[PDB]
Amino acid sequence: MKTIFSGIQPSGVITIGNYIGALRQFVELQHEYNCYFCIVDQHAITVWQDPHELRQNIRRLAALYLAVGIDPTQATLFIQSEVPAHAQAAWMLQCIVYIGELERMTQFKEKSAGKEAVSAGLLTYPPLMAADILLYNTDIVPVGEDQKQHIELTRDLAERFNKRYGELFTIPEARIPKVGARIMSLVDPTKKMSKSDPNPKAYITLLDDAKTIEKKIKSAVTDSEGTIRYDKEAKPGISNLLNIYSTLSGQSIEELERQYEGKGYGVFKADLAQVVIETLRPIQERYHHWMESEELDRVLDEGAEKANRVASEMVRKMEQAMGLGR
Amino acid sequence: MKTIFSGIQPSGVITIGNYIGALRQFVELQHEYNCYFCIVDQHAITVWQDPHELRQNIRRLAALYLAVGIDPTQATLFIQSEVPAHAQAAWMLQCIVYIGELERMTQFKEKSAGKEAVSAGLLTYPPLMAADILLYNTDIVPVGEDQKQHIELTRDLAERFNKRYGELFTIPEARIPKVGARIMSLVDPTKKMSKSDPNPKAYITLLDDAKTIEKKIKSAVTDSEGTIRYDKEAKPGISNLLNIYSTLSGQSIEELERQYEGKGYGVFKADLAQVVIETLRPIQERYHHWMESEELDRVLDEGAEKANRVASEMVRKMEQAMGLGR
Ligand SMILES: Nc1ncnc2c1ncn2[C@@H]1O[C@H](COP(=O)(O)OC(=O)[C@@H](N)Cc2c[nH]c3ccccc23)[C@@H](O)[C@H]1O
Numbered sequence: 001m002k003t004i005f006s007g008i009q010p011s012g013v014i015t016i017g018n019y020i021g022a023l024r025q026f027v028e029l030q031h032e033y034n035c036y037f038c039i040v041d042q043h044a045i046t047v048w049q050d051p052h053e054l055r056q057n058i059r060r061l062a063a064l065y066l067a068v069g070i071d072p073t074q075a076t077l078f079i080q081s082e083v084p085a086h087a088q089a090a091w092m093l094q095c096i097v098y099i100g101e102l103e104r105m106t107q108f109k110e111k112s113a114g115k116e117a118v119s120a121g122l123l124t125y126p127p128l129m130a131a132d133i134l135l136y137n138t139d140i141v142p143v144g145e146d147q148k149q150h151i152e153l154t155r156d157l158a159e160r161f162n163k164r165y166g167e168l169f170t171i172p173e174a175r176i177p178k179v180g181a182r183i184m185s186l187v188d189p190t191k192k193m194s195k196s197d198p199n200p201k202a203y204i205t206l207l208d209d210a211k212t213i214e215k216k217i218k219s220a221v222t223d224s225e226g227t228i229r230y231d232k233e234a235k236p237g238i239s240n241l242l243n244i245y246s247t248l249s250g251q252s253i254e255e256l257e258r259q260y261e262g263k264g265y266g267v268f269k270a271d272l273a274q275v276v277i278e279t280l281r282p283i284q285e286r287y288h289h290w291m292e293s294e295e296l297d298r299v300l301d302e303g304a305e306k307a308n309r310v311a312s313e314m315v316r317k318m319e320q321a322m323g324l325g326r
Numbered sequence: 327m328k329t330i331f332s333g334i335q336p337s338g339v340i341t342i343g344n345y346i347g348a349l350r351q352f353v354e355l356q357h358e359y360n361c362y363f364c365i366v367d368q369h370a371i372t373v374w375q376d377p378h379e380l381r382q383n384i385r386r387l388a389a390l391y392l393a394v395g396i397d398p399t400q401a402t403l404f405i406q407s408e409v410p411a412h413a414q415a416a417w418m419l420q421c422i423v424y425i426g427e428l429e430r431m432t433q434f435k436e437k438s439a440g441k442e443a444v445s446a447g448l449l450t451y452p453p454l455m456a457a458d459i460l461l462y463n464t465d466i467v468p469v470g471e472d473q474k475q476h477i478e479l480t481r482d483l484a485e486r487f488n489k490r491y492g493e494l495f496t497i498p499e500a501r502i503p504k505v506g507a508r509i510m511s512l513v514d515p516t517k518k519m520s521k522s523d524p525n526p527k528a529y530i531t532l533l534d535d536a537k538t539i540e541k542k543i544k545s546a547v548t549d550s551e552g553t554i555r556y557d558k559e560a561k562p563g564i565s566n567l568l569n570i571y572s573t574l575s576g577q578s579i580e581e582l583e584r585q586y587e588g589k590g591y592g593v594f595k596a597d598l599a600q601v602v603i604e605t606l607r608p609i610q611e612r613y614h615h616w617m618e619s620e621e622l623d624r625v626l627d628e629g630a631e632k633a634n635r636v637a638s639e640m641v642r643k644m645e646q647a648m649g650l651g652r
């Protein structure tokens with residue numbers, strides 16, 4: 001079958017935006033493709049990380065991947081740092097990307113703005129993501145819209161490498177959801193929902209309790225038009241709530257507008273909050289189970305084993321093509 | 327004992343400047359220290375390399391290291407790419423160096439000047455050299471003067487890492503020869519002798535034949551003062567020839583000035599050319615022997631084995647300190 005790769009940074013906050021744009025796709029596609037799902041701890045360190053929190057966040061994210069339903073008999077779940085090939089291929093790709101290509105990355109630009117002394121990993125974040133995808137001969141990379149540009153640079157590098165050294169890499173393609181590719185902040189629906197928003201009301205974490213989810217959904221900024229209809233430009237707040245509702249419930253945006261015909265924001269938010277609770281509760285129960293189990297470590301051990309077998313071989317072919325080593 | 331590390335890029339030209347500033351020190355110190363001497367093929371690719379020539383140049387350089395006298399029972403000779411830890415530690419160090427620190431590197435500035443689209447590896451050349459030195463708990467790094475600045479950034483990174491994550495690295499120190507730290511071009515003695523000078527008369531390669539060494543020494547730019555006396559500012563050409571003569575012959579600069587008292591440039595150059603021939607001939611004989619032997623591969627196999635054991639352990643401690651993995 002075709003191969004899928006995708007990764008998530010281990011951090012203190014994993015949002016419903018991460019779930020809807022990514023994790024939901026991973027669970028959907030796992031049985032139909034060869035799947036590698038990575039905990040990108042080397043990318044995490046492109047900004048300072050408290051070492052104790054980083055180690056815990058890596059375990060947390062592995063638990064969340066398993067809690068949402070990633071099945072180790074269907075997919076390979078592993079930690080980026082435990083497969084040396086990622087670092088090795090990243091170096092090779094860094095030698096073929098131009099500085100100007102990295103500087104124009106929007107992710108870099110945003111993460112480094114108003115900064116005084118920027119750390120180099122932030123700039124070289126792309127070749128490492130490109131190595132993550134290309135090591136596995138990846139065909140599809142399911143992500144939310146914010147990663148599209150990185151995937152576009154990955155395709156540019158794979159093409160450049162193939163052209164200079166011979167056809168080695170598969171040119172990967174992004175798979176971005178139709179609805180929910182970009183879940184927006186509940187506090188300012190013109191902004192993406194971000195793990196690092198300083199306002200905790202902007203996002204819902206996958207570990208938010210029921211009272212908390214109710215409070216954040218109820219406080220979500222809307223409009224004065226009291227109509228439940230999708231219109232991103234005119235009604236960003238309601239439109240974003242409709243995307244969250246649709247993707248989590250399985251109901252179309254049309255279905256939801258009909259259902260809420262003549263209805264006001266109060267009932268709509270109460271219902272949505274319950275749909276979020278319904279979704280997160282089981283995830284959280286499974287999450288705690290994994291966090292307390294020795295099996296979490298076993299799953300990651302096996303996934304690293306498989307990923308190392310494949311990636312190490314691609315690295316050998318890349319070295320051979322560039323004429324490194326012997 | 328103390329530990330020494332040093333590296334050389336595999337390239338089409340290895341000069342008497344490389345020999346005098348570096349290789350000569352490696353042979354001198356090998357019995358007194360734990361020594362790692364590396365063929366930096368990952369650094370080589372920071373600029374485009376023809377893959378076939380790169381593979382040959384790596385073997386050539388390994389032969390030259392053995393030909394000049396590096397003894398595998400005293401030192402560990404290995405290829406950078408064959409030890410994944412270098413790439414892994416380079417990533418970690420790249421996440422803690424600032425972009426501005428890299429941009430001010432003179433090596434980067436020179437290699438990238440008048441350039442149109444610069445390759446990222448050229449900019450991130452330092453963290454990889456820093457990882458090369460720090461992986462082995464290096465105390466001393468014998469090099470010529472042009473690497474001093476990179477070693478200074480390495481010390482800055484080791485200190486920064488120790489300060490943020492705990493004392494792990496030894497702060498390394500450069501060992502730069504008193505005479506011969508910077509062998510100058512024979513064509514323009516105000517310029518460093520460089521492997522990539524477009525004028526082949528500017529350098530002597532370790533594989534230059536006798537007629538060739540005579541021609542290059544005889545053509546070496548001097549002055550109209552016909553006096554053999556060291557004075558870098560006033561007599562750069564003669565001063566540089568005196569450094570080459572001194573370091574290769576074992577005779578002091580004073581000894582040589584006395585010896586050539588009242589003598590002219592002709593006799594002096596004829597003698598120097600013979601001193602260069604005397605030095606390179608045995609190196610070349612041994613060089614061909616290694617190039618035709620299966621033992622060259624065995625030596626590199628064993629050196630990679632040892633280097634991997636040490637470097638992989640340092641990488642595990644670095645990951646532990648940053649909280650990567652598990
Ligand atoms: N508000 C949102 N709406 C919709 N989707 C969203 C939202 N916020 C986040 N996402 C998606 O979640 C995944 C993980 O986000 P990260 O920031 O860890 O995503 C990142 O930081 C990547 N660089 C990690 C990575 C490293 N290597 C890779 C290789 C393939 C794919 C991804 C990666 C991503 O799919 C992201 O698009």
Ligand SMILES: Nc1ncnc2c1ncn2[C@@H]1O[C@H](COP(=O)(O)OC(=O)[C@@H](N)Cc2c[nH]c3ccccc23)[C@@H](O)[C@H]1O
Nearest residue numbers: 332333334335343344347348455458469470507508509519
């Ligand atoms: N004209 C000259 N006069 C005196 N010494 C000279 C002259 N030209 C070159 N050298 C010395 O030769 C060694 C290798 O030169 P490279 O350009 O490969 O040198 C380089 O390009 C390094 N970045 C390779 C490296 C990679 N990792 C390392 C770790 C430790 C030490 C060195 C390295 C160096 O010692 C260099 O100073």
Ligand SMILES: [N+]
Nearest residue numbers: 030031033074
């Ligand atoms: N699968």
Ligand SMILES: [N+]
Nearest residue numbers: 356357359400
């Ligand atoms: N030694």
